[PDB]
Structures are given as structure tokens and as C-alpha cells.
Amino acid sequence: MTLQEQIMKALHVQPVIDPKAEIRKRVDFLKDYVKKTGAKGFVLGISGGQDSTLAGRLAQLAVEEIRNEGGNATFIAVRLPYKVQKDEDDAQLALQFIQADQSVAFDIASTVDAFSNQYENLLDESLTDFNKGNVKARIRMVTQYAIGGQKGLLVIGTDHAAEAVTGFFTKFGDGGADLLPLTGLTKRQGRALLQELGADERLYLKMPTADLLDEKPGQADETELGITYDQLDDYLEGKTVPADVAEKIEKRYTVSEHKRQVPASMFDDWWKLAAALEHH
Amino acid sequence: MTLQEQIMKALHVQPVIDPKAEIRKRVDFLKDYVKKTGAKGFVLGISGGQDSTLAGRLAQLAVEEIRNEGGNATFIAVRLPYKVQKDEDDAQLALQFIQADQSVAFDIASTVDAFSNQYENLLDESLTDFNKGNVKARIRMVTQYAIGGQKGLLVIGTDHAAEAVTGFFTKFGDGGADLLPLTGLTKRQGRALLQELGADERLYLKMPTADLLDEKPGQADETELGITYDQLDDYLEGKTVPADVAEKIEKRYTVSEHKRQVPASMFDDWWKLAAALEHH
Ligand SMILES: Nc1ncnc2c1ncn2[C@@H]1O[C@H](COP(=O)(O)CP(=O)(O)OP(=O)(O)O)[C@@H](O)[C@H]1O
Ligand SMILES: Nc1ncnc2c1ncn2[C@@H]1O[C@H](COP(=O)(O)CP(=O)(O)OP(=O)(O)O)[C@@H](O)[C@H]1O
Ligand SMILES: [Mg+2]
Ligand SMILES: [Mg+2]
């Protein structure tokens, strides 16, 4: 069991998949979980990006099936821009594809700014662009849970293997959710499901970006990672990649284990086994 | 095993403890974890309540020890009142016991209110007192992670067995943290450690409360739970409790499992095993 193989197993990666079958299993999962909780549906932030576009369509398909089976369910798609979003057009395109039961726009700027201003005033320092970025992600979580709390809906998370292996998400930000329909999927597999679902190609060819920085809006995930999704997917799907690349993927995986586990206690072994861990 | 024995095991409860030894193991844990992360210390919200008073003191002892060992570390105690806290006096007493390296005060009202006003504005509905309360807990998490990110500090969590068994915490609010030094302790045992640390009796005789509601400030945990900590501790320590009390505890434990697990995916078994889950 090489590290690459342990990672593939831990992240539930399927080297080869059947898009129609994956969609069936993932829509079934959303239905099975919600039935267990007695919730009234789901809520999800739609950014115009690939992951939320796919997760959103799966959620709409799920509630429509729940209603067809005689149940009661609704899906609310939520736009969460910080001021004017650079790629609002792509978000609208995603909304057109998702065809959600309900959609609403919630500018998170006033909340994020109220916080940053207060921080600056009381801590005698300004938030670095990166840290304010994480505030944005966390406020998006807050917004989705508030709507979920008010309407009795579960919060959908968009985590998948290509993001999980690098711990490329904000802890308790977009990482905070109730259920994950995309777990185990590589980035390219995600595009494959989108194609099967008949999505406009602009929805899966668009460049992946967390778009949280004020000074570098729309920054490419790969620019930040120093690794391309092509390499990540190759690695995750069990293919051979340059020792150079493998080492970089594996070190990022091992140091971010804390983001894939519940808070650490003295009774947990994962952190003791880890040679090291990095939070900042 | 009885469900009680299963719960005791799952939550790492020790029916009998030696306060002195517990403090040593828990302080050692904080030192061991931070050391493996290269972080510069810890950050924790100090409410004036039992849990943060104890976790706060353990963190201070941990950084003093790290420094005595030739390392570099600091502990920042942070006051997080929403506007003006009724028991600010108890919080001041707590700070005098903790004797943290540094302490700051951060009013979360402007951020929370900015959010609430935007919510009412955009969803044409006001947040219920309970949901606004969760917004407060979540903004407290945001604040600690902001300070942590800015100063390279790990966020301490105050979860313990008496809270874990009932899922009595806000998901991604006070539930969001990096490490938990109090894991496994019953409420009663926590007081024992505080007594061993020579805490002013007011710090552990004070009524437990999340104090998140505008309409019912300082509301007792027991009132909300319908279960006393005296009963929870007896149950957790392996003692006999009335059948009806045990039933209520066990039902709450089973339905709150999702709060003690990372977000659910179709590959997890815990939710499939659960006969029912409760999010609202
Ligand atoms: N501006 C925005 N509006 C709404 N939701 C947003 C958002 N920015 C982030 N989110 C939420 O946060 C999640 C994580 O963001 P990302 O990591 O960038 C994946 P994505 O944006 O959905 O596709 P991507 O990889 O193409 O960038 C999104 O899937 C979405 O649910
Ligand atoms: N007003 C406040 N100021 C600072 N931190 C606060 C706070 N209210 C809540 N917190 C943070 O949230 C955590 C969880 O709150 P509680 O569940 O009520 C435990 P406690 O307040 O510390 O002791 P308690 O059980 O006596 O209420 C606290 O331990 C603290 O870290
Ligand atoms: Mg994105
Ligand atoms: Mg309290």
C-alpha cells in the first residue's frame, strides 16, 4: 500500500467510473441522508464554478425525485458574492443549468467588512488579504447555515478528492457542511458528470478558483497549488506522475490531515502518526 | 455492551480520575500537538464560564512550559461579548485566574447585527432568536480563527464528554476548533481539575450557560436540555440513573451523531446505521 494508494483509498477514489451510475448513486445519497434527518431540503452556495454547479444540479434532481416519490422537499440555490462578483455571468449561467426551485442573492460584504473594520480597530492591525479571504468563506458558511436553520434545510458541501487531497478549502468555511455528494470524484470526473448532465461547456472548462483575494481576484487554484488538476487527477486515478510532483502532492496531503478530521484530542492517533502538520 | 458502556467508551470517559494526573496529560497534549505544527501558540475565547476558564488555564500552563523548555509560545485570551455581557464580572474573575500572556476584547455585535440586518432585508424575514444565537457562536469562531491566522496560533476548543453526549454546541461555532484538551471529562470532573488548580470557587459553582439568546439571556443549559449535569455525569461515569433519564440521554446522543463526525458522504456508515438524525 503505497502512500498514493492509501490516499486513493482514504479519499474513496474510483480510477474508472460510469458517469450515469455515479449520478444515480450521488442523487440517491442525497435522498437517503435527508430522509434519515426529516429535513425539508437542501441549501447551497452557487458560485458559477464547477463544483457548486455539479453539486447544485444533483440537489435539484434529488428534491424533484423526493417530490415524485410523494415527499416534501425544496432546494434553494444561493448567490454569495462579496460586493460585485467578477464572474457573476458564469454564476447566472450555472443557475440557468441548475434550474433550482428557489434562488436568492446575499451580498456578504457588509458582514465581512463589519468584521474586518472591527478587527482593525481593536487588534491594531489589518487582516492580511489571505485571512480576510478566509473570513469571506466562513461568512458564506454562516449564511448557508442561517438559511438552512430558518427553513429546515441541510447544507450541501462541495468537497471532492481533487480538493480533499490538498486540503484546498477553508476549515469551517466551505469545508463546513452537512453532507458531501461529490466525495471521491477527481476534477476531470466532475466535468464528466457535468457533460452527462448536458451542461454548457463553459461550466466545466472554466478555470477553477476560490476567488477570495481582494488583490488577486479569480486567482487560479493551480497558481496557488503549484500543481495542476491534470496532475492531481492523474495521481488520484492511480497513474504515474513525476517523483517531483508526487512528493509535493503527498506532503500537502500529510500536513493537512487536521482539515479532514474532527478536532484533535489526546485520544486521536492520526496526529501522533503525522511527522508534521501545518495550519498556517 | 449496553449503549451506556458504548457511549462511555466512544467519548473516552474515565469513571475515576486523578485531577493532578489529568492536568498533566492534558497540558502535555497541548504541548505535543502545537509542537508538531510549528504554531506560535494558542487562542481561546474566555466567557467567564467553567469550560473556557479551565481550558484557558491549561493553555497558559502549556505555553509557560514550552517557553521553559526553550521554545517560543504565547496564549491570547479573548473576550467575545455580544454588545455588553451581563456576567462580564465573572469573565474578569476568570481572566485573573487564567493569567494569560495576552488578552483582548472583541465585541461581535457589529458583525452579527450586520448579518442579521442583511438577512431580514434579503429574505424578508427576521432571524429567530435561536438562529441569531447560532450566528453569534459562529462569529465567535470566525474571530478566534482570524486572530489565530494573523498570529500563527491554534484555536483551542472546549468540548468535553458532558457536552459531547448531548451534542450541546453549535456546529462550526464553538464546535469549530483545532484541538480539545478537555475531551472525555464530565462536567463534575472539570470542576475537580479547577479545584486542583486552586480556582476561585465562583469559577466552578457558576451556572453553565451558552448565553446566546437575546430574549432569554444567561439561560441555564439544564433548562434547555431538560437534563441536569448531575444526571449526565452519573450516566457518563457508569452509574445507574432512572430508565427514563437514560432514554432521553441516549436518544439525544444517537440523533446528534452528525455533530461528532466530519460531513457525511455516501461512503460513511455511521449515518446508515443511525435510525434517525436531527439537525433542527
Ligand atoms: N461567490 C460565491 N457565491 C456562492 N457560493 C460560493 C462563492 N464562492 C464560494 N462559494 C461556495 O464555496 C464552495 C467552494 O468554492 P470553490 O472551492 O472555489 C469550488 P467552485 O467555485 O464551486 O468551482 P471551482 O473549483 O470551479 O472554483 C463553492 O462550491 C460554493 O458552494
Ligand atoms: N461571551 C463569550 N466570550 C468569550 N468566549 C465565549 C463567549 N461565549 C462563548 N464563548 C466560547 O464558546 C465556548 C462554549 O461556550 P459554553 O458552552 O457556554 C462553555 P463555558 O461558557 O466556557 O462554560 P459554561 O458551561 O459554564 O457555560 C466557551 O468555552 C468559549 O470558548
Ligand atoms: Mg470557485
Ligand atoms: Mg457558557
Assembly state here?
homodimer
Largest sheet of chain A: 4 strands, parallel
Distance between the first and last residues' Cα of chain A: 30 Å
- Percent of residues in beta strands of chain A: 5-15%
Report the CATH topology name of chain A. Rossmann fold
Number of helices of chain A: 13
Largest interface: which pair?
Answer: A-B, 75 and 75 residues
CATH-scheme architecture of chain A: 3-Layer(aba) Sandwich
PDB class: ligase
Keywords: protein-substrate analog complex, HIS-TAG, ligase
Assembly: dimeric
Entry title: NAD+ Synthetase from Bacillus anthracis with AMP-CPP and Mg2+
SSE layout:
2 copies of one chain form a homodimer.
Chain A: H1 3-10, H2 19-37, E1 41-45, H3 50-68, E2 74-79, H4 88-98, E3 102-105, H5 109-123, H6 129-151, E4 154-155, H7 161-164, E5 179-180, H8 187-196, H9 202-205, H10 221-225, H11 229-236, H12 243-255, H13 270-273
Parallel strand pairs in A: 1-2, 1-4, 2-3
Helix pairs in contact in A: 2-3, 2-8, 3-4, 3-8, 5-6
Give the gist of this structure.
Two copies of one chain form a homodimer. With 280 residues, chain A is of the alpha/beta class.
